[PDB]
Amino acid sequence: MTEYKLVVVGAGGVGKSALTIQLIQNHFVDEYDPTIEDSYRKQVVIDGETCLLDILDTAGREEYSAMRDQYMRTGEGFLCVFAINNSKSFADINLYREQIKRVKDSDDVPMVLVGNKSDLPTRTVDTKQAHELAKSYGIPFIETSAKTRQGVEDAFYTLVREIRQYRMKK
Ligand SMILES: Nc1nc2c(ncn2[C@@H]2O[C@H](COP(=O)(O)OP(=O)(O)OP(=O)(O)O)[C@@H](O)[C@H]2O)c(=O)[nH]1
Ligand SMILES: CN(C)Cc1[nH]c2ccccc2c1[C@H]1NC(=O)c2ccc(O)cc21
Ligand SMILES: [Mg+2]
C-alpha cells in the first residue's frame, strides 16, 4: 500500500486535534489540551486504493514555531486549519502557507484549506473570504466541524487526492 505523510497545521485552538481525533476515533474532544506533537498511522480505503496515512498533529502555540521547518520538509500534504469564529487564525493561514512554500521551494505543495467550527452561530470569517483565499492559492477549501463530524473525511481524503495528483503530475 501507498503511504501519505499528512501535516495538520494552524493557530492554537482552531481544532487540529479535535479534527484528527474525530477522523481516527469518531469522538469529539470537548476539552482544550494544547498539543506539543502527536502522530497517528491509519489504514483507510480511498477510491479503491489502500492508504496508510501518517498524520502529524502539530502545535499551534507560537512558542513551538521552531519544530516547523523539519516537519514541513518531510510532510507531503498540509491541512491548513483556521476557525471560522477566529479572524486571527484565518490571517495566520497566509503565514503557514508562505512558510511551507519557502521550506519546499515550491509554488504547488498538496494543500487543503480548512474552515473549522462550522457548527457555531458566531462566525467572524464569511465563506466568501475563505473561498476567495483558497481560490487565490489554487487549493480545495473544506468547511468542517470536529463536533458534528461535518467535512472531516472530506478534508483528509481531499488532501490525499491532492498528493496523489501531484505525484502522478511530477
Ligand atoms: N464547536 C466546536 N468546537 C470545536 C471544534 N473543533 C474544536 N473545537 C474545540 O476547540 C477547542 C480547541 O480544539 P483543539 O483541537 O484542542 O485545538 P488545536 O488546534 O488542536 O490546538 P493546539 O494544539 O494548541 O494548536 C476545544 O475545546 C475543542 O473542543 C468544532 O468544530 N466545533
Ligand atoms: C513517522 N511518523 C511516526 C511520525 C511522523 N509523521 C509525519 C507526518 C508528516 C511529516 C513528518 C512526520 C513524522 C516525523 N518524521 C520526520 O521525519 C519528522 C520530522 C519532524 C517532526 O516534527 C516529525 C517527523
Ligand atoms: Mg492540538
From Swiss-Prot:
GO BP of this protein: MAPK cascade; positive regulation of endothelial cell proliferation; Ras protein signal transduction
Keyword list, A-Z: Acetylation, Cell membrane, Disease variant, Glycoprotein, Golgi apparatus, GTP-binding, Hydrolase, Isopeptide bond, Lipoprotein, Membrane, Methylation, Nucleotide-binding, Palmitate, Phosphoprotein, Prenylation, Proto-oncogene, Ubl conjugation
Residues engaged in binding GTP: 10-18, 29-30, 57-61, 116-119
UniProt xrefs under PROSITE patterns: RAS
PTM (free text): Palmitoylated by the ZDHHC9-GOLGA7 complex. Depalmitoylated by ABHD17A, ABHD17B and ABHD17C. A continuous cycle of de- and re-palmitoylation regulates rapid exchange between plasma membrane and Golgi.
Gene Ontology MF terms in the entry: G protein activity; GDP binding; GTP binding; GTPase activity; protein-containing complex binding
The reaction(s) this protein catalyses: GTP + H2O = GDP + phosphate + H(+)
Predominant localisation class: membrane
Positions of glycan attachment: T35
EC numbers: 3.6.5.2
Pfam families documented for this protein: Ras
Source species, domain of life: Eukaryota
GO CC terms of this entry: cytosol; endoplasmic reticulum membrane; extracellular exosome; Golgi apparatus; Golgi membrane; membrane; plasma membrane; tertiary granule membrane
Regulation: Alternates between an inactive form bound to GDP and an active form bound to GTP. Activated by a guanine nucleotide-exchange factor (GEF) and inactivated by a GTPase-activating protein (GAP).
PANTHER family in UniProt: RAS, DI-RAS, AND RHEB FAMILY MEMBERS OF SMALL GTPASE SUPERFAMILY
Illness association: Leukemia, juvenile myelomonocytic: An aggressive pediatric myelodysplastic syndrome/myeloproliferative disorder characterized by malignant transformation in the hematopoietic stem cell compartment with proliferation of differentiated progeny. Patients have splenomegaly, enlarged lymph nodes, rashes, and hemorrhages. Noonan syndrome 6: A form of Noonan syndrome, a disease characterized by short stature, facial dysmorphic features such as hypertelorism, a downward eyeslant and low-set posteriorly rotated ears, and a high incidence of congenital heart defects and hypertrophic cardiomyopathy. Other features can include a short neck with webbing or redundancy of skin, deafness, motor delay, variable intellectual deficits, multiple skeletal defects, cryptorchidism, and bleeding diathesis.
Quaternary assembly: Interacts (active GTP-bound form preferentially) with RGS14. Interacts (active GTP-bound form) with RASSF7. Interacts (active GTP-bound form) with both SHOC2 and PP1c (all isoforms) to form a tertiary complex; SHOC2 and PP1c preferably bind M-Ras/MRAS, but they also bind K-Ras/KRAS, N-Ras/NRAS and H-Ras/HRAS.
Protein name as catalogued: GTPase NRas
Organism in which the protein naturally occurs: Homo sapiens (Human)
